[PDB]
Amino acid sequence: PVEVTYKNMRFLITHNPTNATLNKFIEELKKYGVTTIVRVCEATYDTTLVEKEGIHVLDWPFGAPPSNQIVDDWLSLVKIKFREEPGCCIAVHCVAGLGRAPVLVALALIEGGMKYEDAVQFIRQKRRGAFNSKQLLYLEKYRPKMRLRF
Fold this sequence. Notes:
CATH topology: Protein-Tyrosine Phosphatase, Chain A
CATH architecture: Alpha-Beta Complex
Largest sheet: 5 strands, mixed
């Protein structure tokens, strides 16, 4: 798992767990203080146990760039969580490796004040292979709202 922090934000880009390894998964998320999981790819495990531990799971599946709705919901989540729950962490994962999980994190960083190249370097310092060709071109044309206050 790679962890990235900037301003009042802290994200955990993790791997997709399985029903059989949910206890260890939850145990680790709790140690990282995560109270929210965003699944941006296929949903492959039951969330009842996760939700009961106070960890809310969000399924925003999205190659194809995140829809404007997903981006808006993501930015709304980043805004409120790190404010209402100081020092918390938001986890994000795909299905096979990092995948597209780091895309939303980069968006949060850009929204935080970084230009896309900075966000990409910032993530790669933690995960060398982060972002493929298509994703870089997408991040390059992303027009941030720049409405988050810090």
